[PDB]
Amino acid sequence: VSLGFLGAAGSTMGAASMTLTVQARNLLSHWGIKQLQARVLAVEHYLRDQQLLGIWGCSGKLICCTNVPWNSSWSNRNLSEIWDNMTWLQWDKEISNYTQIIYGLLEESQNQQEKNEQDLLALD
Amino acid sequence: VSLGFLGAAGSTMGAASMTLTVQARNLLSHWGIKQLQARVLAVEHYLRDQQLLGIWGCSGKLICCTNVPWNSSWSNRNLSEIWDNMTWLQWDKEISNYTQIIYGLLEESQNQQEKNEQDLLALD
Amino acid sequence: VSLGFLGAAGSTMGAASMTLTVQARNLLSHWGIKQLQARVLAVEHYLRDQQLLGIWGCSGKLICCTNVPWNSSWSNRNLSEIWDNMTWLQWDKEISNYTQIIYGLLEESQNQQEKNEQDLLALD
Amino acid sequence: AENLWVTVYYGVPVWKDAETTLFCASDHNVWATHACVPTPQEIHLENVTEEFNMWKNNMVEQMHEDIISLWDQSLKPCVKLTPLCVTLQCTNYAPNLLSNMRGELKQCSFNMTTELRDKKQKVYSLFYRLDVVQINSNKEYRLINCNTSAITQACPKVSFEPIPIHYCAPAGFAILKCKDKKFNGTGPCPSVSTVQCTHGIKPVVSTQLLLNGSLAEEEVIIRSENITNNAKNILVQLNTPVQINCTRPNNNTVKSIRIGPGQAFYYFGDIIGDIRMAHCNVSKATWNETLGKVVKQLRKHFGNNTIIRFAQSSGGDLEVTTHSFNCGGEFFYCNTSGLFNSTWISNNDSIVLPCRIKQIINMWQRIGQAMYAPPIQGVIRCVSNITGLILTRDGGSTNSTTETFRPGGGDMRDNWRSELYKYKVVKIEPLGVAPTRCKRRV
Amino acid sequence: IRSENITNNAKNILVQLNTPVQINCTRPNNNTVKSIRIGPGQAFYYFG
Amino acid sequence: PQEIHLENVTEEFNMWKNNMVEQMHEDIISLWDQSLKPCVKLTPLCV
């Protein structure tokens, strides 16, 4: 059964990954300025992360996969002690300093390395 | 030849399905408030149905296909007596009560059932 | 190294094609009307070309490929004298009269010819 | 492989000419910087040519509208000074004086309502000559601009110094910047660069000279469109600034009165000290050397030997025929007839300038309104830089060797064409079409 | 003829013609006008 | 209504530094004097 909006906020990442869409579907749901300064402000907040997820080669899906190594110098945990016990709120802290690094080299490298290939393959 | 905007509005569904794009291309084409209360109101009406069509796994295409059974208890017609004689305006009536049911179980089930699979397949 | 915004504006098309994403990432970055008449005006300028690129069957990618013949009556150059010497600014001139023709028959033909096929293939 | 097909490309560096709006960037109150967004990061370009064209920019048309709206709304909540247009009984102040300043400084007396509408009030005050007019023992004067316009008083706490601002472009646009040393008005520029938004722009208001402005490179530059045609203006720009000092040496007191419920009115008091006349100095030798430099640059369009002569202004209202600016809150009108004297053939002290002061002002020529300006207690001093002059020529017959120059201008738009010349708005279009040998799958 | 319900006399009746019949209307006096200044900068016209 | 209950999650609340009180404090006084704009101005009474 659907818990509702932000229902799995205290549950395990592996359990929260089962239900993702309910968090997405509620995202776009003189005094007239205040009813337009807020209505416009919802839009590009949606559009920024939509465009950022588009440039990572996997705009359509939700569970995207890419080939970039993790390099455990950033954080050093095992597979079990991530996906069984802690939640996403604890996960946000240890990642919060590597974000611009991760957002960079995922973006600038991989889709530029990809589009060389089908340009050469469909040539032949 | 292109009939124009809403040209096939009285024709057969099978004939109207031949031309779909012309209906899509015209979709985004003190007194300044009225020229912005309307200009903003076009946007999320586009963005809502864009996001709804995105979450159904087939954002890119137009003629999407999914594996959900029809369950003829909703309506009981022939493959021939749908795609040969009536138009979409008659089709809107008998479907208008099942819409929230169809929008639900298409969405909540299938793409959640899909993303389990490539998570397990690309594991191995 | 990244040259920056509009860095390859004088370089070869073959060299400018190496770096495309930096031009894309900077695209969405009483007196309150002027801070909203401009903020809204950025949006549909993004949304128009996003929707136009969506209807050409290749919304996700950047280096799209289609099967439409070039028909050298439009312009008559070889492969080498396009991709080695001139820049895009010189390229804009000789194409500027065929644009509505190219935007038409790419759009109206091909994705309509495509969607007939998987409708018939997945039938069987 | 020979049968080429078509591909598209997203995010391609190409642009077009188009013109949209701008907005602030800036870091008690002034006219401008009440509430808009706080603020370099330029990017170099190379071997890209571009045809700039000033005098046809649309950035100058937008800001010229955005000043006068910004000027007007910062005057609305102040006091409406309607009940002052009464009959004035008035005589000359400081009689039997043998100096220059005689016909100014009239002392008047009028009535004015107090907070109680049944009581009235008598007051003594002073006014300059250029704002009172007799109507047909003392005589009977009235104000200069009452039969046409309802006059208002500025709020006395807000001020009028210039604050540097930046004009900044929204997303989906860019600003080009020519980085050439010598550059006339219209032509290509081989060294461009993209800047998100520009350097500081001081919105000084002035006629017949240019104050507080940016310099140029090592040689002075003349600029116009078609110098053959005598109808347009001529922009010149200097490299070494010349200084002027201006003052207004007499001492002043101010007083207060209450015309109605809550409202307040200020007026001019009296003179403690010595009746003097406000003036402006300039260093004599470096001004002569500056004129001798600018005539050498001017001779490149008129052969070697033609007689060059400077002359005074022609006519028009006080706005143009004299030099006018604001030093620190009170408004000046200086004669500057002593700076466009003797001609030129191929083979420690200073200059004084008389300068009068006016209170009631209609800048921007708009009918129906006019503003007041309250006096300032204490003496006033200003230093500045003169960077650039406004010249125009005259006609003449075919056989002529004397080609004259008179300092004109007056049209306020050229005060910003001297500063916003090296910029051009532009629009990015990220979708392009080009062929290759690719062919998609089935 | 167009209305909402002819049996009910509460509503209105809209009729529409095909051939327009003309109408002329005029007023033949001459009427000089004058002017006066009411306050500072304002103006008032009246009948002469 | 239509509330949604949560579980297991903690949060460090902090009143006296809330930003919701700053906004509504302005939204009273702007809505207060706006209702006196069309009413009668009582200037000629100070007699």
Ligand SMILES: *[C@@H]1O[C@H](CO)[C@@H](O[C@@H]2O[C@H](CO)[C@@H](O[C@@H]3O[C@H](CO[C@H]4O[C@H](CO)[C@@H](O)[C@H](O[C@H]5O[C@H](CO)[C@@H](O)[C@H](O)[C@@H]5O)[C@@H]4O)[C@@H](O)[C@H](O[C@H]4O[C@H](CO)[C@@H](O)[C@H](O)[C@@H]4O[C@H]4O[C@H](CO)[C@@H](O)[C@H](O)[C@@H]4O)[C@@H]3O)[C@H](O)[C@H]2NC(C)=O)[C@H](O)[C@H]1NC(C)=O
């Ligand atoms: C081209 O550019 C040049 C750049 O220099 C411009 O030249 C300057 O223009 C400004 C315009 O604002 C002139 O400023 C004015 O200067 C007056 C003189 O002040 C000086 O002397 C006093 C003597 O005691 C000093 O105290 C001052 O020092 C102050 O600043 C230093 C900074 O180092 C501090 O350390 C000090 O503690 C002081 O804070 C100056 O050296 C000055 O009086 C005047 O300010 C008055 O007016 C403003 C607005 O009303 C008030 O905010 C301010 O408090 C003063 O208030 C007067 O009026 C109020 C009204 O209520 C009264 O109540 C007060 O009693 C008082 O009478 C102003 O700041 C500057 O002199 C000038 N020159 C130089 C060399 O900087 C050109 O103008 C420009 N050309 C243009 C625009 O055309």
Ligand SMILES: *[C@@H]1O[C@H](CO)[C@@H](O[C@@H]2O[C@H](CO)[C@@H](O[C@@H]3O[C@H](CO)[C@@H](O)[C@H](O)[C@@H]3O)[C@H](O)[C@H]2NC(C)=O)[C@H](O)[C@H]1NC(C)=O
């Ligand atoms: C400034 O205005 C001047 C004055 O008219 C313009 O220069 C003129 O440009 C025209 C170009 O059509 C010249 O006409 C040509 O004249 C020759 C004979 O000299 C004739 O054989 C050609 O067929 C053509 O008609 C004209 O001579 C020239 N005037 C002068 C005095 O040289 C010009 O348009 C403006 N801009 C500048 C000079 O940058």
Ligand SMILES: *[C@@H]1O[C@H](CO)[C@@H](O[C@@H]2O[C@H](CO)[C@@H](O[C@@H]3O[C@H](CO)[C@@H](O)[C@H](O)[C@@H]3O)[C@H](O)[C@H]2NC(C)=O)[C@H](O)[C@H]1NC(C)=O
């Ligand atoms: C305009 O107003 C008249 C008011 O009379 C409306 O006509 C009425 O419509 C009703 C339908 O509900 C008729 O009732 C029926 O009458 C028959 C015969 O009496 C009876 O057998 C049925 O069981 C039913 O009761 C009513 O008779 C009829 N009135 C008349 C005079 O014909 C009409 O509908 C209104 N039109 C519009 C456009 O509003």
Ligand SMILES: *[C@@H]1O[C@H](CO)[C@@H](O[C@@H]2O[C@H](CO)[C@@H](O)[C@H](O)[C@H]2NC(C)=O)[C@H](O)[C@H]1NC(C)=O
């Ligand atoms: C425009 O500028 C580019 C980049 O600054 C120049 O690129 C050079 O291209 C030649 C090939 O013709 C190379 O041998 C050089 O190494 C490049 N210079 C670099 C990479 O710094 C180009 O020369 C310029 N265009 C013209 C026409 O000269």
Ligand SMILES: *[C@@H]1O[C@H](CO)[C@@H](O[C@@H]2O[C@H](CO)[C@@H](O)[C@H](O)[C@H]2NC(C)=O)[C@H](O)[C@H]1NC(C)=O
């Ligand atoms: C103030 O208004 C009064 C009202 O008329 C003007 O002078 C009066 O003149 C009559 C007749 O000459 C005298 O009896 C009054 O004593 C005067 N009263 C005052 C207050 O002067 C007078 O012109 C106005 N005063 C000024 C300075 O304009």
Ligand SMILES: *[C@@H]1O[C@H](CO)[C@@H](O[C@@H]2O[C@H](CO)[C@@H](O)[C@H](O)[C@H]2NC(C)=O)[C@H](O)[C@H]1NC(C)=O
């Ligand atoms: C407003 O008042 C001024 C000053 O009284 C008028 O200007 C003068 O008008 C007379 C009319 O005979 C001329 O003789 C003067 O030469 C004018 N003074 C100048 C030009 O400095 C002005 O005409 C009035 N405006 C109106 C009544 O509309």
Ligand SMILES: *[C@@H]1O[C@H](CO)[C@@H](O[C@@H]2O[C@H](CO)[C@@H](O)[C@H](O)[C@H]2NC(C)=O)[C@H](O)[C@H]1NC(C)=O
């Ligand atoms: C500025 O100074 C000049 C220099 O005196 C003034 O010019 C005089 O104008 C009168 C007008 O009738 C002539 O009769 C004089 O001969 C002129 N003086 C000289 C020395 O020739 C001028 O009036 C002053 N004011 C303005 C506004 O230009």
Ligand SMILES: *[C@@H]1O[C@H](CO)[C@@H](O[C@@H]2O[C@H](CO)[C@@H](O)[C@H](O)[C@H]2NC(C)=O)[C@H](O)[C@H]1NC(C)=O
């Ligand atoms: C809330 O916390 C509790 C305990 O901290 C979690 O415990 C679960 O309790 C249910 C009911 O007995 C068991 O079926 C689960 O196996 C327990 N999980 C664990 C990890 O012990 C619970 O997961 C948390 N979330 C919710 C929504 O109750």
Ligand SMILES: *[C@@H]1O[C@H](CO)[C@@H](O)[C@H](O)[C@H]1NC(C)=O
């Ligand atoms: C990976 O981590 C190591 C650990 O020191 C670090 O030196 C390196 O820069 C990181 N990145 C890559 C791409 O190796």
Ligand SMILES: *[C@@H]1O[C@H](CO)[C@@H](O)[C@H](O)[C@H]1NC(C)=O
């Ligand atoms: C968990 O991670 C630790 C390293 O921190 C590792 O030694 C251990 O083998 C992992 N797996 C467990 C406890 O099952």
Ligand SMILES: *[C@@H]1O[C@H](CO)[C@@H](O)[C@H](O)[C@H]1NC(C)=O
């Ligand atoms: C993240 O960076 C901040 C910056 O000082 C530092 O204080 C914090 O400890 C860092 N946290 C982690 C988990 O690296």
Ligand SMILES: *[C@@H]1O[C@H](CO)[C@@H](O)[C@H](O)[C@H]1NC(C)=O
């Ligand atoms: C078909 O609809 C009926 C009636 O609503 C429902 O009982 C049944 O579960 C449905 N079956 C399928 C396969 O959807």
Ligand SMILES: *[C@@H]1O[C@H](CO)[C@@H](O)[C@H](O)[C@H]1NC(C)=O
């Ligand atoms: C169509 O459906 C009817 C029942 O609705 C069925 O009898 C018929 O065989 C089907 N095919 C035809 C005749 O259209």
Ligand SMILES: *[C@@H]1O[C@H](CO)[C@@H](O)[C@H](O)[C@H]1NC(C)=O
């Ligand atoms: C749809 O539901 C409404 C609700 O009362 C009902 O009146 C109507 O008959 C229904 N139509 C169909 C086709 O089921």
Ligand SMILES: *[C@@H]1O[C@H](CO)[C@@H](O)[C@H](O)[C@H]1NC(C)=O
């Ligand atoms: C291709 O170019 C030829 C050259 O004349 C022209 O006739 C033709 O219309 C063009 N288009 C097609 C689809 O052949």
Ligand SMILES: *[C@@H]1O[C@H](CO)[C@@H](O)[C@H](O)[C@H]1NC(C)=O
């Ligand atoms: C370039 O194009 C010309 C036709 O304009 C052709 O003759 C030549 O073979 C092409 N290739 C070269 C010069 O390598």
